[PDB]
Ligand SMILES: COc1ccc(CN)cc1
């Protein structure tokens with residue numbers, strides 16, 4: 022279920038799910054480096070009926086995973102609301118900015 | 132004699148992998164990439180070296196030596212990809228072999244596309 | 254008998270040329286610009302642009318500018334962000350201009366990589382992730398100014414009625430205007446009143462740009478405008494793109510470079526889809542609507558062919574649309590656009606097409 | 612929850628396979644995809660820039676890549692290199708400099724190998740004059756250019772000696788190179804002519820035993836080279852074809868198109884009917900299983916359009932690869948049994964390799 026773009030935590034992912042790339046929803050595949058920064062999503066949990074803040078930390082320094090590409094735009098906003106925006110590379114500040122995959126880490130309730 | 136000049140033929144005919152002089156092409160036809168059968172696309176560089184084919188011309192019934200010069204120094208054109216192997220041979224007959232990059236000796240070895248240059252009668 | 258030659262120019266006249274920025278997202282380190290003849294769909298050439306290239310054509314039509322990122326060993330080693338100048342006719346590299354290592358890496362919105370109307374400065378978006386606008390002096394071939402005044406703002410809207418002024422959209426819902434000096438440093442700036450509610454009616458960043466004013470569309474199908482006929486920007490809106498029948502089906506805009514203005518007619522073109530709701534703002538066009546900006550009323554609607562981005566040629570009265578891979582050419586000399594042809598497989602992953610200026 | 616890195620491949624080494632994806636459409640972004648052959652799970656990858664080659668260290672601890680960089684990819688200085696990567700962490704460790712003549716080409720096993728003792732990497736060069744390069748792994752140094760291999764092609768290591776290998780030469784024979792302690796050439800020998808280059812050219816891919824190698828030809832004949840002794844002894848041809856096979860024009864076809872199951876002496880070959888000039892790289896209509904001792908075909912099964920294979924001796928497994936999909940076969944019995952298919956393992960791969968276990 023977490024490999025589906027319809028998985029509720031993936032509501033503002035524009036990228037490849039790391040869980041399809043040898044990582045997991047919350048871990049980078051081997052040899053890919055977590056981004057310290059990210060855009061954040063507000064996604065509705067269908068189980069408990071609540072909305073949660075999800076941090077979309079990219080994994081960086083390897084070329085594109087190419088698996089489970091998702092493009093979901095729930096509550097996503099343009100670059101003038103920069104940390105809600107997913108059309109930029111959140112690997113941008115990494116030692117190496119090459120984009121590999123995206124993680125979907127639950128932060129808390131919205 | 133008209134079949135010896137690709138410039139006079141139908142663009143659809145020369146852009147096809149089955150065009151007679153493309154018989155040992157493994158790559159993208161430069162003619163689909165902003166070049167022609169015998170000219171590199173703008174900003175790509177001819178390879179000094181090449182593998183060579185012998186291709187039958189069904190139109191005049193003679194066999195011809197075709198030099199497969201690549202155009203180099205730009206990324207993959209991606210268009211009209213052909214993989215034809217008529218009279219092609221392994222690397223121990225190196226200049227008959229098309230599974231190596233004939234851009235290999237260029238200033239920039241990035242492979243862009245492949246031309247089919249008529250050397251002459253076989 | 255024959256010899257392979259290079260050194261050749263693009264076969265088709267400049268007036269025939271369009272530029273399709275292929276991000277190649279699946280292999281984003283090998284992005285590139287595909288050059289096409291819009292009259293017949295012929296591939297004319299390409300310019301490689303490494304990781305997440307951006308592209309524009311010099312205002313004078315002689316040069317193509319690209320912006321990209323390299324590393325010594327691609328996935329490791331030192332980063333070099335650069336603007337490149339390439340010859341438009343030979344499609345050959347001429348020079349590299351160093352940028353600080355914070356040029357925006359992101360999808361090819363027009364407003365991330367632009368130039369002043371006079372062509373003398375390239376104006377680009379930075380994000381480190383703090384935002385600033387970078388200024389590159391074309392004559393010097395140097396980076397000459399970092400506009401930190403634009404922190405918290407996004408994208409570059411050149412003002413077509415001034416040589417070296419532009420606007421950006423800020424997170425207060427207003428516009429910041431920057432007026433450059435002849436040295437490319439900031440001579441003056443001003444901030445508009447709030448144009449839009451960032452929280453309640455966020456706008457798309459893509460302007461529908463006229464000589465002295467810009468129109469923007471919102472997530473909910475409203476239209477806002479910034480008038481820069483004078484030194485201070487005057488803002489207004491919203492007016493709705495939607496009539497009462499449109500409201501039944503929840504029509505809303507969607508796309509990336511999703512709007513355009515035909516300046517002579519005042520006609521604004523917008524990608525639209527029904528069944529609008531939270532999260533549909535990047536959905537492909539079910540339709541293209543054509544709005545008279547003066548009467549504030551739709552004058553036409555045609556099927557959108559799943560397009561995501563567009564561009565307009567003022568002189569030839571053309572609109573191009575792009576679904577990611579295919580380009581459609583429309584004659585827009587009349588209110589209802591007429592489809593002329595489609596160029597299939599122009600790109601793998603392109604959200605931006607541009608005309609060669611003529 | 613907090614995002615962590617530093618992880619190793621999640622599956623045991625014994626389950627790992629390596630699909631070398633050339634990504635020919637975007638050849639500057641080649642990479643190695645690492646899969647679990649037991650369940651088809653994607654485990655990770657290693658980027659390999661332009662036309663990467665890969666092998667795993669004999670000891671299973673490292674991944675070795677060979678690739679080419681340029682300072683600005685399509686321009687600037689060339690750097691040909693071997694890289695050493697940790698097999699479990701899939702992280703870059705070390706770059707070893709090569710002269711700028713490493714082979715650029717399709718991923719035949721024989722262009723990038725290592726000695727039995729694992730101490731030297733042995734690689735094919737082409738300038739376009741061919742030589743073989745020796746790289747001292749320990750020292751991280753290129754140590755020897757074997758120009759004596761000029762006019763030959765590919766590296767066939769000898770599993771019965773620590774630092775010896777053969778190459779196929781344009782005289783239809785084999786050249787053996789025997790390395791000294793330092794990686795320089797100690798001795799060498801040339802075999803008699805094995806095959807007729809003009810009349811019965813062989814595929815370069817060996818069906819490799821512990822002290823013998825078999826080769827198939829364009830016309831379906833089999834040649835052998837024996838290196839149990841001090842000097843190589845050559846034989847052949849014998850034909851893979853019976854009378855019915857000949858009348859249907861069955862011939863071999865593919866790239867890494869053969870394999871040997873050593874315990875049984877079974878040779879696996881990709882075959883297709885209606886063979887003629889120019890079909891030597893056609894996908895397999897069938898896989899044929901030949902008894903090399905009896906010289907008889909003992910099985911034939913659907914080829915699933917495969918082009919390359921590899922064998923695991925200890926688990927009795929054959930993998931086949933059609934360019935994008937990997938098929939796993941149980942080959943413990945004469946007739947292979949298909950266990951599974953991994954769809955979309957690569958975009959353009961002609962080489963798959965098992966992680967070494969013995
Ligand atoms: C650099 O272009 C990119 C790259 C990555 C992503 C993913 N958030 C979006 C745009």
Ligand SMILES: COc1ccc(CN)cc1
Pocket residue numbers: 157158229230231232233242661662715716717
């Ligand atoms: C560098 O690998 C390559 C590149 C190009 C070609 C095409 N002859 C074959 C192999």
